[PDB]
């Protein structure tokens, strides 16, 4: 469909809109095609695999193709990053991060049934089920 | 004279099964047919040594609904001397106090004047249990052979301790305890249920037992009791949303002694299961029944 | 049932002209012939989330003068939950709150129980306007074709904003606004008067218009609103002494919602023009009329 | 493109994503096609002209077609509603609406260069430029 | 001895143009070459009758950077007696007080001990103006022929009143005043600028003049000063974001006496125009210069 | 420059084993040969956003023992802005704050100025662990192959969490945990010890292990953490008297971060095992060592 750019496919239901909001992908000025029930198409923008990895917590089974000159010049997939910044909120109500001009930041640790997310500031560790719930 | 005439109401543990049914029957009769002059010419002291606006408004409304006059205060001299003086003024003393046993001590200095315990520290709060029992009986039609789940801070919730002991005076009840390990139901309660052959079980989430529950009793989980971060990692186990009630029995009621913070989401309020505000309204009739039985010889 | 039966009284802007005359007629009838048992067996909640002793004593005296019982408090849980609970207790809620719109919110959770706004932040205080209107009607014989001067902090005096809008529902009134430039009548009020063709004018001192004035409405000029020295250089423009009344009309009345600091000197108190204490006494009958109309089907 | 449903076209730049978030249009379960740089396509859902009017403050020059059986069975456009609920936030910090389980609600009043929005609770009136700024 | 040796520093209005340049030259010299033992064996009293942690830390750091000892307090006896006692202890008194004129009064009881005004109510705060002047001179290379915009609460900002009067002692400056009508620059300041033939103009938003501005002086607009809703409708006129600086001169600096709430968005902090934290750091050298000139005979 | 020159000291978890030995070696050298002028001409900010007199006096004495000047405060503006300002004043920031992570946030706005965490909520307090380690090393001659018992509130004692993790960086240590079930050592600590093959065991009373213990680390058991009556039934398990030390090793030391209430009876004070006051005195040298290493290029 699109000329040069990037595509994100096989996003679970009720996650494509989340990816658009949480990663501010519609804060560009060139074309974007989106289909829900989800898939997202952008033209002419870099996506480091750091940024594709940031989709792992939300759309783990998904793919990203770097497209140039109408051609598939790559097909990368997300795998768990070491750090997740900006998008998560620390569930510790006494954490300094809440009232202050800083970016949230969590260390990522895979577990048996869980992802362990450790806040950079309060140094408390939480389940990813707890962090993504509020 | 009725069995509770001029009696002190200090502890649920002092109330026999006949006492419980007497209070509940009187509460139902006063609800069906109010008696706004039953206690005319009575003066009742509303003594809130420890302030509690929500408790006081309920108690004082009960007094006025029966026609009694009310004097009182919210917030040195010994408690014994204070009661020695006030008991020369009034016909009954309703008192809330920060120290455990304060209501019991008051009875030893009040003479003929009855004392009604509105809460003595972490000990007893009998009218909260009585309004809970009255609400369960009203919505379920009975107090026996019920499935009762109790959620939240079971370790420090003296409200569930009292309700459990009161419900244990009726037959065939089955209990579900859903609490974090750090706030579990105390062992002395579990021992009491074992001595009576009463069935109980622990569950880590409400969805395990939702299908069987007749009463879902939610409690305050104050953030004081744990770390602020310890809270967040366990709090999902003990918060209720409307979507959690998809397989609930038609007759189930959600109860909560109030105030709620966020253990019950506001989208529960509009379901037919939400009954915590109706529960609070029932405190008027349970407290009316207590004042009527204690201050009036003949039954309602 | 009268047009205000079981209605909420939240804002003067919600009161039609017929509503205003209904309240004022009822207030006059209750003043002439008290009905001390009209509201016997009613229980009214006096909920002063923001303390106001002068407002509360007036409201509670009104309740007692009609025979109602009163429970209440002065000074976490959402306001919605508090009303959800209290509205199961009482027959009406009189409430004062620091947040604007709190009374309006209460109506959405009080069910069938009417809410009477005793003041919600800097928004509305309807019974103050109603007692002002009642006092003007009583002393002048009408609410139309009057010359009304209003002095002091017109910018932040929500009391004069409400009285102006209420008086603007009657014909032929002429207004005089005497305020410092920093505390002038807001433009939205002047626009409202222009849309209705109502005459108004600005004046820098009371002596310009004293000869024509029927009502002199003095307001609090709190020192907060300006510098302590900014105050002193303008304050003479807006303080009243007895010698200022030498050419006043025989029928003129000085009004003030109270408390006064020194905007009205004490030598005004003994002149026949001083009517702020009589005005305060009229709050009993305006608030009685509201409770009577809201809680009693048939008119007085 | 779509079978039966509704379409919203000629949405100004940087407003299509706003309409999706503010009106929770992706909280359905049937097809949604979106193109940015904006236009939005939904299948099988009512849109009262009350709800189309709610787009006036954001996408004033736009159109809405009710589509059934692959056919254009209507072409309505938004014009200013009397009330706007849920989506706006009262700029009065002392308004009761902020900490409480109620829906925001504003009366709408057209002015020379302005929309006047009067809060249902605090009864204060603000410019639409002030309300939409925070 | 230098012209300011053993002088009191009470009001900017007492400082001649030569005085201003003397302080600013000394501040630059102490910044380039610190003298950490200049005031060894001096003891200075840090008397904050009105607490101000941000002012005190700056002043006390200045004292220590010169090697002086510090005794003091933050928060009955007359102020005259307090100074009569403390001036027998110390070599200089730095004082902040809630009453206007307190520093001037102290000079009449301190004997030979100099008094440095750290703020007396709504009157004077000379070292804030001196650090502002020093920062403008450092970033612009001069204090004459500048375009200075001042934004926010100009009516009650005694900080801009003082800076305007100080800058009016230099030639060819042009001022832009951006304030809401209720918080406009007072007329006595505008009169002063007219008497000296100094050009000034009013503007309702910063974008009108952004292209010509050398110094953008932002001020605190406390919510106290207006209604909470009056604030919101005007506040956009007086808040600064990074996108507002798209056509700013390369040399322009944003100043702010601090603390900021939200008049300056945090995305301004990373632009080369943000200079309010550098401005705060310059308070050390302006206050060092004052202590050095007052307590040391020979110039730095 | 030494490995810690101009480094922030935020968390013990950030300190390598070489870092720990560097601090401890410097502390021993400064104790043996004080350097009262090492930090002359340095100005250090003592920022106690959360007051702690016992911590502040120790830290400020350390600063003065090295010759540094001290400005500070005990007890709106964002913390980021406060640090943005203060870091233009001083050469280092020592800060205690009620919010977790506050010291880490300060490092992102302090520029080149190092931040030393004196306690950030329930997170980190590195100098308490460092003085504990220094005291253990001084009395036992090493930090490896020790038998360390830790008694009291192990669940909420962040002081024992940090000391355990620090001691786990040395070999052959064996731990004894003596706590009530409601205040047990958290599982994440036990997991950490298991991953490293470090031996540990639980014990319900100190007498089980007294004979093998090299260090007895007693903690505060605040009454907040349990019921007032829950306290009394378990408190004997976790209180120390002199008679409990009858079979203690000659080299054993009793440690306590202080203050003690009654977990250590006063008759322990006179035994050679009592070392909590010597431990407190060692905080001077551990905090001196940190300031010396951070602010001085060359090692002591
Ligand atoms: Zn955190
Ligand atoms: Zn509002």
Author numbering:
A (entry chain B), D (entry chain B): 11 to 47, 57 to 153
B (entry chain A), C (entry chain A), E (entry chain A), F (entry chain A): 1 to 75, 85 to 309
Authors' text:
Aspartate transcarbamoylase (E.C.2.1.3.2, aspartate carbamoyltransferase, ATCase) catalyzes the second step of the de novo biosynthesis of pyrimidines in most of organisms, which is the carbamoylation reaction between carbamoyl phosphate (CP) and L-aspartate (Asp), generating N-carbamoyl-L-aspartate (CA) and a single phosphate group (Pi). E. coli ATCase holoenzyme is a dodecamer composed of two catalytic trimers and three regulatory dimers. Under physiological conditions, E. coli ATCase can adopt two states at quaternary level: a low activity and affinity T (tense) state and a high activity and affinity R (relax) state, where an equilibrium exists between the T and R state. The catalytic chain of ATCase can be divided into two domains: the CP domain and the Asp domain, and it is the closure of the two domains that trigger the T to R state transition of ATCase.
In this study, we solved a wild-type apo-form E. coli ATCase holoenzyme with an open conformation of Arg167 and investigated its importance using enzymatic activity assay, MD simulation, and CASTp analysis. The crystal of ATCase belongs to the R32 space group and there is only one catalytic chain and one regulatory chain in an asymmetric unit. In comparison to other ATCase holoenzyme structures, Arg167 in the catalytic chain of this structure adopts an uncommon open conformation, which shows an 8.8 Å conformational variation from the common closed conformation of Arg167. As a result of conformational plasticity, the side chain of Arg167 flips out to interact with the side chain of H170/Y197 and the main chain of Ser131/Asn132 in the open conformation, while the closed conformation of Arg167 only interacts with the main chain of Gly130. Different from all the four ATCase holoenzyme structures referred to above, the structure we solved here contains neither mutation nor substrate/substrate analog. Therefore, it is the first wild-type apo-form ATCase holoenzyme structure that adopts this open conformation of Arg167. In addition to the interaction between the open conformation of Arg167 and His170/Tyr197, the open conformation of Arg167 also interacts with the main chain of Ser131 and Asn132, and the latter further interacts with the regulatory subunit by rGlu142 and rLys143 (the r before residue label indicates that this residue belongs to the regulatory subunit). Therefore, Arg167 is involved in the hydrogen bonding network at the interface between the catalytic and regulatory subunit. In addition, CASTp analysis revealed that ATCase with the open conformation of Arg167 possesses the largest mouth/pocket, which means this state is the most accessible conformation for substrate entry. The binding of pyrimidines or purines would affect the hydrogen-bonding network at the interface between the catalytic and regulatory subunit, strengthening or weakening the stability of the open conformation of Arg167, and thus makes it more difficult or easier for Asp to enter into the active site.
